[PDB]
Amino acid sequence: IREIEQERASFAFKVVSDIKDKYSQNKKVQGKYSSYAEKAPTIILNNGLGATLAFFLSKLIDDVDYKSINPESFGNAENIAYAFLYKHLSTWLAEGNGKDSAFSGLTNGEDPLKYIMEKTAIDVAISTEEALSILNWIKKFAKAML
Amino acid sequence: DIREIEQERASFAFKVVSDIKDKYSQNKKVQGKYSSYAEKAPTIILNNGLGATLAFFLSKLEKPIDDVDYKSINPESFGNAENIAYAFLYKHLSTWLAEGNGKDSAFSGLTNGEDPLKYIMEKTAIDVAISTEEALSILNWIKKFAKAMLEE
Amino acid sequence: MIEVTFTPYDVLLFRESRPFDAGSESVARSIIPLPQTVAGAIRTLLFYKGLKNCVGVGEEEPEFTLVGIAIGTRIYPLPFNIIKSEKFYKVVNPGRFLGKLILPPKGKYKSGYVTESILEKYLKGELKEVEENKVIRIEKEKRIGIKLSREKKVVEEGMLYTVEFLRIEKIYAWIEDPGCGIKDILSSYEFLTLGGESRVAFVEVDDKTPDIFNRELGSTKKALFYFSTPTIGKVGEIVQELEKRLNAKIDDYLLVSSRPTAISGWDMHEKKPKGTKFAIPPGSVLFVEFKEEVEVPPYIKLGKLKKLGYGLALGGIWE
Amino acid sequence: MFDMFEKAVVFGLYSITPVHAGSGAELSVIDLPIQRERHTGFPVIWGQSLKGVLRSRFRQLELDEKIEVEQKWKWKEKTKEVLKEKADEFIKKVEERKRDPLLTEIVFGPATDGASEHAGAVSVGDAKILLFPVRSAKGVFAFVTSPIVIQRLKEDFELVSEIENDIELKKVELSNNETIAGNALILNGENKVILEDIVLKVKSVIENLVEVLKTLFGDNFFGKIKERIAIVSDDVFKSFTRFSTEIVARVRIDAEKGTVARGGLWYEEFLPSDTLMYSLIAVGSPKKLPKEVDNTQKIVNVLKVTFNNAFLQIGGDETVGKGFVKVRAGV
Amino acid sequence: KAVVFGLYSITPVHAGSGAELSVIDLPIQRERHTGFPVIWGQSLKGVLRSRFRQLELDEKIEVSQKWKWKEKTKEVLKEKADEFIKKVEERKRDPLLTEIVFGPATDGASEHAGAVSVGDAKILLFPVRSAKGVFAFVTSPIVIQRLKEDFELVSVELSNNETIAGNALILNGENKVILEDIVLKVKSDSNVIENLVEVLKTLFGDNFFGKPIESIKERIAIVSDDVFKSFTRFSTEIVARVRIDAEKGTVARGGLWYEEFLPSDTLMYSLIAVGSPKKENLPKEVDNTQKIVNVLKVTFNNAFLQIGGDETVGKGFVKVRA
């Protein structure tokens, strides 16, 4: 339960750094990502993980595939920040830090939203807790870097 | 290891919305109408009731609101985009209340296969209340996937 | 030779010589086990088994001979001519000045333990240094206890105490039995009390001579003697004893050592402390240049109280 | 074989308002979670939380001479009867809140100043969940429990049995999609129950459990249930206790601007009302003594009379109407 | 001879260690070398001695007759019996059998030693929250190896991502176990869990402290040494406690601290090494090791004890199998 925290922190630092790198001169994008990262756990708490992912989906389709998302191809800061947070959260649940690391995800590459629709209630609960935990780490680095 | 109804709701909602997008990929009107009607439906239910909502859809198809089984309704047999969409929405909603997401799923409906509107006009107020809440819950998920997938 | 293996159930206390009475001086710090403590544990078992002939009740020594002891995880204290330099412990060989063997200045000694294999290479003169990670320290475990009132469940006045235990995996003891039947009696026991605070160690016994006692070092003038257990007696008498037992005179010798080992103990027969004796500490090395070539023995017993496990020296060579 | 105690009393606790037995702030979406047993995830109230509540109430009652022993308990008089000479100085300590009144210190132990004098006579056990309220499609809500909870209740009865030396005082298996439930919860013509977001199949135990509840808390249930009792599997029950608690957003409003102030938005968890918990209260021989309370039985009697049918407040947020429970103390 | 004491916690346990290095104000006792939770031999012995002493004074000790310690004291110490009994009432000494078994009270320490050596209670099964089956009884290869060594003398390979677990912990078809918030993949294994249960049955009997040992088998999870150590160090209860200034109704000055607890549903074992009773002129029914062992078993088997601190706030209660 300690090594998993380090893995989360490593991922969180990486994705926030990518945000700050690509949009260094764009404070609006950085600020939007930060706000959404803070609001995200709340949306999950009050609506569940499934609905939250669906809510992100509406901010972007043919199929539910986080891989196919391209955050940089959007017009405004709101959609760019949403697409990034959505992909980050989905990537973590599906891939972790890669298959060369301790944590390689929970869903084995499957999109978390479709995963929720197919697997058991237990599978959904662990995905919910894990989602809250990674967002909690993203919030830390967001406040300190963005 | 059991599943929660929410999982079945999301699953069913994705399936019926994908079914429309598949059968009418070139028809943005049908997709746009369905999304509008899915969005409108919960508000009608809260103000006028579930029974009046199901009957409201059937009246759009000019079907006798008293002598129609949901299974007999085939959305792919209508001309205008409006009636196609209404038929789909009525079908999807009724199927959910009648059969859920399947007999071996974590939710197999509330009306035990009986037509929901006939069920409403035959059962007690408490039965209708339970079905009404469930109708709102499945429509919430239909709206979610319609908003993201269906185009205008 | 019989090999006894003690496996501590949990912790061990080999208390230093200092007052440790409830309601007064209340701190017990463990030292590295002295061989007489191990001898005492064995003698006490025989004392209770009814073999009071081999015990030596009220005597300094028993009838049998404890060859020596060693702790294990088998490890030995760093020879005192091994000096830490950065991240390495370097072996420092004897020099000569004014016709006298000396140890050249190369830094201060730092305490620690090495495996039996590292010691073997040292004794063969093939060891140059040891990486600091291969130098072991003995783990201590500090416990703080109290005494409660019988009824009120609160601490009685002044009844708090501290013990610094050792966390040791194994203690090995080697015994030469002149026919007392120690191997059979030890086999009948699963455990025994060893050291203080009524701690016990499991007992295994095997009829075997450890390989380190069977080494062939060859013949040379330049022998060294690593003391694996404390050695009691004047250096002059020990060197003279060495000359007699190997039938060879010595041109010069150098004792590389440290703080003398203070040895007293508790006399269970008379129920009072034993008299204080002073010993050459384990890890000390006696470098010897014999007048003629000698066959360096794998081990040799020197000094006083041999039967209590003292004076176990391991043979070696230097250049 | 539990000879350190001589008698025991079960403290039944029924919440009539939401309860926040807190564990402190966390860096999490739920800023202020309730107390939980970590390896089961079950909500608890630690014995030290409950003891502090019981002590404070008992103390105030003794200071106001409302304590009944055998007539009224005059602690100053009994103090003079026990401490004799140095009784006056002790009473002065109490009025200065340095020490606590005699019976209070006998039962719960001395105030922090006299901690080293003697230990408390009673052991206040952690409160554990017995019935947890869960919304139901039919019957509004259900009193939900599980085999592992029923088992822990039986084991606690074994504790009481060992303590009171009463051997006379001393099987539920369910699939995850199954339940044993009262008639009020069962959907019309389906043989199914819907609790929260889970459909459960009705299985053909409750009557016996109620009889047990009738033993500890009397013929009446806290002045009020079998029709809404639902027994579910251990893991389903566990998920309910962890995800069906009240989670509430609270704010601090700037009194001048009418808007949320900085550092004025947090989420707080509450154990729902209509939750049944219980704590085992073990009583040993007093370690400090007047004849009225010189042994275990007399101390038990005082405890029973003092707290049975009483109302207590446990946890924080008392000022916003949280933590109010009704107590039943039976042997 | 020796007696193995199995200890099963039914409430959280705080065996206090002042010397333990921790960020917690009041941490529990732990082993130096392994970092595992432990109950010191001296803590356990104190608990055992206090219980035994109370029973002796209350004439509840059985040796198959009622032990009358004052009668036995007179037929043992003879002319010195009356002054000894006086010391016992004066709490300067303990009753006869108590001092035979555990040694004299400190005043009479030098007279003779205690017959028993009370060993540390070592951890065996540590409860960890499981997504399936509520919680798992978790152990490790190093623990099993220690148990086997202690038992054999008194008479497994896992990666950090793997677990050998019983069926009740395993997600259907996924071959996974979820302990708290981490996922371990199930390693196929045939007899290791079964072997462990057999060892437990050989030491404590068919009933596992009030339940069939076969039920426990389905909820045992064997994890790697590093993972087990992690759980025993970071999954113990860390609880904030306060003191309220009732004058103000707020937390008093210096009235906040943190305390660690070993959870309930923890299994530990202590080897009680029994030597010959060392007091002079012993009564016949307790004059050797076997007789001391027998009294120990009857007195503590199926007993309930309180270990550690926080007794009055309901902590430290364990079931005993001897």
Ligand SMILES: [Mg+2]
């Ligand atoms: Mg001692």
